Amino acid sequence: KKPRQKRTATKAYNVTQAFGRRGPEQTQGNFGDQELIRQGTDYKHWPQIAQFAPSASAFFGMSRIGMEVTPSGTWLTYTGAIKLDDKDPNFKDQVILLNKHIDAYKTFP
Amino acid sequence: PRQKRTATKAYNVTQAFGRRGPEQTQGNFGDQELIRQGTDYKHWPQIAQFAPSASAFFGMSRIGMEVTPSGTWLTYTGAIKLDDKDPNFKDQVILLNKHIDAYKTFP
Ligand SMILES: Nc1nc2c(ncn2[C@@H]2O[C@H](COP(=O)(O)O)[C@@H](O)[C@H]2O)c(=O)[nH]1
Ligand SMILES: Nc1nc2c(ncn2[C@@H]2O[C@H](COP(=O)(O)O)[C@@H](O)[C@H]2O)c(=O)[nH]1
Ligand SMILES: [Cl-]
Ligand SMILES: [Cl-]
Ligand SMILES: [Cl-]
Ligand SMILES: [K+]
Ligand SMILES: [K+]
Ligand SMILES: [K+]
Ligand SMILES: [K+]
Ligand SMILES: [K+]
């Protein structure tokens, strides 16, 4: 299997198979409701979320990058913020869609 | 949008993503040569090897939303573990460390 950062989740190799379970810890992802976790890029509204992911150039250009070492190895750390356009005609739906998936695991039944 | 921009010799890292610096939403990555070249940089493929796919970006990161006087911001934090079994591991560690906070050494 490809290095983690190059994995593409789909129904056949889903979000928790490729990127681990959702949770509150620093090395855990917190994004994705039950539908997105199970479907990955097969998720119907996936393109509306992917529009906000950065290109390789923007990931290294916009982010604060670091290099940390832990008992498990060497990690490339990254942090940043992407400004949405609150004048985009779909701004209201984009906010609803992102929030729907942000910390969705906290209310899984 | 800014997150889909591609920096090149004609539209460099500073023009596309702002000057490097120490602040929280300020990019700190790139020596003068990478800032000048962007994706045209001699070792750009070795750097792009660490950039996440859209799926890994939303799968690995801690995503949030912050609404302030400047707008609505999608925040992100995470860490990508290097594979110490990758034959390029030594070069990857040296290359990343070279460009992290390189701006501190020049105007
Ligand atoms: N750091 C950062 N600045 C941004 C982003 N989007 C827009 N800006 C800033 O927003 C300001 C207003 O310009 P505009 O948004 O109309 O292009 C600019 O000075 C620009 O740098 C973003 O995602 N990140
Ligand atoms: N959160 C996180 N865990 C990772 C990453 N790469 C590997 N791991 C985890 O690190 C452990 C060691 O696996 P290895 O990749 O060294 O065979 C496993 O628990 C694996 O899931 C990564 O980029 N992020
Ligand atoms: Cl561009
Ligand atoms: Cl190269
Ligand atoms: Cl060098
Ligand atoms: K989970
Ligand atoms: K790119
Ligand atoms: K460290
Ligand atoms: K939408
Ligand atoms: K993808």
Side-chain angles (χ1 to χ4, degrees), chain A residues 17 47 64 92 102:
Chain A
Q17 278 179 290
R64 295 207 54 75
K92 81 157 289 273
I102 289 170

Side-chain angles (χ1 to χ4, degrees), chain A residues 58-77:
Chain A
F59 174 83
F60 282 97
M62 295 175 65
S63 302
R64 295 207 54 75
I65 304 293
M67 282 284 272
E68 300 309 326
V69 301
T70 74
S72 65
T74 293
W75 297 79
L76 182 175
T77 66

Side-chain angles (χ1 to χ4, degrees), chain B residues 75-106:
Chain B
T75 69
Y76 62 92
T77 67
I80 297 168
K81 185 172 157 192
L82 274 67
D83 182 1
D84 62 351
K85 308 270 109 295
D86 188 325
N88 307 307
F89 182 75
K90 172 206 179 176
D91 286 356
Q92 296 173 334
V93 173
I94 286 159
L95 180 64
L96 289 164
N97 282 297
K98 175 182 190 197
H99 296 278
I100 292 160
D101 292 339
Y103 81 89
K104 292 183 176 171
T105 69
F106 53 80

Side-chain angles (χ1 to χ4, degrees), chain A residues 16-75:
Chain A
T16 62
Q17 278 179 290
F19 315 114
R21 73 188 163 105
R22 325 284 79 204
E25 308 293 305
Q26 283 299 296
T27 62
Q28 289 177 317
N30 70 332
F31 194 97
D33 73 357
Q34 290 162 279
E35 198 176 6
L36 176 57
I37 281 170
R38 159 184 95 244
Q39 306 176 359
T41 66
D42 293 333
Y43 178 64
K44 193 187 159 186
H45 314 293
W46 177 256
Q48 294 155 61
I49 297 172
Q51 77 185 306
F52 302 119
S55 66
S57 186
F59 174 83
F60 282 97
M62 295 175 65
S63 302
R64 295 207 54 75
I65 304 293
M67 282 284 272
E68 300 309 326
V69 301
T70 74
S72 65
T74 293
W75 297 79

